[PDB]
Amino acid sequence: SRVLLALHDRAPQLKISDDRLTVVGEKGYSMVRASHGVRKGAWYFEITVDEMPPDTAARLGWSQPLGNLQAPLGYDKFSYSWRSKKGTKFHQSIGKHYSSGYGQGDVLGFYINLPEGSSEIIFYKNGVNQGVAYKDIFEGVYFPAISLYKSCTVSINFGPCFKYPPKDLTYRPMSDMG
């Protein structure tokens, strides 16, 4: 059925709402993946930062199944992330300059393209392209992925309707996987 935050594929310390679309962090960085992942084509989803108290943060993006649930997204070779703090992008624990930061009330967009042509990961802030973050990524299945540092709160939207659908970007909503 519908795409949701995964039932078991999640760090146990994260507090997931009953509807499985909202999650709150707990102490050190930890991660939850969606219930469905994609292998080919172009796909999109959104995450809204509901609340970002002082000294809390998020690293949001895409993860293969082996991505470590007890580490920030982007920690290892299995995922790619975008940090709320300073807009840094992370992969294999290397943080690089990417965009400006994002915070409470921001609606972030997450694009991936896996041609059956080069693979790409692109991040959006309230509908606006923040630039290509990663290109020619590792082959595999990628799941929408949330990692949180301390008690900030985010909500994921897999579609079909997005808050800020990007202009001239073709994709299927992650909800199509449902």
Next chain:
Amino acid sequence: FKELDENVEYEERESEFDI
């Protein structure tokens, strides 16, 4: 070492895992 009387839960930083 440094003596403690009780466990302390390590307080990780945001950057705990970064290079």
Next chain:
Amino acid sequence: LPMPMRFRHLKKTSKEAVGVYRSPIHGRGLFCKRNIDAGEMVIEYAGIVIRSILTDKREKYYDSKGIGCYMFRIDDSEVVDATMHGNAARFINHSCEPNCYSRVINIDGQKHIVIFAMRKIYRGEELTYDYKFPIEDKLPCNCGAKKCRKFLN
């Protein structure tokens, strides 16, 4: 007694019940200064509680500084790192015929490693437990017991 009561009594009394002295097994050991009944808490293996994922980072650091690493795993998810902050429990030697055992207890949502007495232990005895090291390819054991397994690992 509710575990947090037993645990409170432990923390309030362990300093006067045990002490560190030279050991005939090895180096310095932990010793009983007053009789302890079977099943009673002896001392906490105290230190900094870290997530399991942080052990590798810390081990490599200590290794680079030539520092002996003192960690006691709680479970798959957490470890007590007593390398830099800890207590006298660090001095408890291994024995192949120990008089204590370690168990994990839960207090107010936090896990603690506590050493318990296997039997009634008398004043002056050295306190020991089985380290339960996995088998390597070796650290000679000097516990002195007739049933000594000759190596810790």
